Amino acid sequence: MNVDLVFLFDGSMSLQPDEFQKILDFMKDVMKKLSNTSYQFAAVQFSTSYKTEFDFSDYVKRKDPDALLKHVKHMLLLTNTFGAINYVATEVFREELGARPDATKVLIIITDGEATDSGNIDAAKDIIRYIIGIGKHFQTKESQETLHKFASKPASEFVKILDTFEKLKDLFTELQKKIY
Numbered sequence: 001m002n003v004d005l006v007f008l009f010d011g012s013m014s015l016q017p018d019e020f021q022k023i024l025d026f027m028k029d030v031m032k033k034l035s036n037t038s039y040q041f042a043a044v045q046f047s048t049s050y051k052t053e054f055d056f057s058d059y060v061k062r063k064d065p066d067a068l069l070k071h072v073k074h075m076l077l078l079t080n081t082f083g084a085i086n087y088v089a090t091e092v093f094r095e096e097l098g099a100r101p102d103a104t105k106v107l108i109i110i111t112d113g114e115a116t117d118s119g120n121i122d123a124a125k126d127i128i129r130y131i132i133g134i135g136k137h138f139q140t141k142e143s144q145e146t147l148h149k150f151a152s153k154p155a156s157e158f159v160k161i162l163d164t165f166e167k168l169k170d171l172f173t174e175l176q177k178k179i180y
């Protein structure tokens with residue numbers, strides 16, 4: 001349907017270069033698949049700070065995932081996930097930046113660890129929120145639970161755990177199908 005979807009992706013120092021690249025490729029795969037639909041996309045990299053890599057209006061103008069992401073630079077700092085989610089809620093979903101009043105808001109968060117900051121994400125709560133937690137830091141039920149606070153309910157649907165960044169490929173294949 002009419003979906004305004006934002007990727008919020010981790011660019012902290014704990015991600016290896018190849019891992020950060022797998023994230024970019026995942027986002028391109030998704031966008032390529034949903035070309036020529038009612039989907040609109042935006043992407044934000046977060047680390048210590050929050051960098052909008054492209055807004056919805058950027059997407060409407062070009063609709064080319066390669067061009068939209070070509071200058072992305074890995075920030076290699078902290079993992080301020082609380083600040084990042086609030087940033088998306090208030091700074092990215094705006095009509096002035098191409099967001100649509102009647103579109104469903106979706107936020108896809110991709111990270112390798114726990115947030116380095118703190119607070120709440122009240123402002124983003126109405127958004128449909130998936131979080132993809134990847135790698136060695138999420139190998140136990142207890143470590144995986146730390147992500148639930150960022151996601152819609154139930155966690156069994158909205159929190160995805162991958163053992164490696166190579167599994168983003170497999171996740172895309174699975175997601176591809178859910179497309180009606």
Ligand SMILES: CN1C(=O)N(c2cc(Cl)cc(Cl)c2)C(=O)[C@]12CN(c1ccc(C(=O)O)cn1)C[C@H]2c1ccc(C#N)cc1
Nearest residue numbers: 001003030033104106108128130131132160175176178179
């Ligand atoms: C199932 N589902 C889903 O897995 N994701 C999802 C989950 C992850 Cl981890 C990553 C990415 Cl990129 C997308 C979604 O966003 C949805 C929920 N959804 C919607 C859309 C609209 C409404 C609504 O209006 O209520 C509710 N949910 C759209 C749907 C979807 C499925 C596959 C792809 C691909 N490729 C992209 C989107």
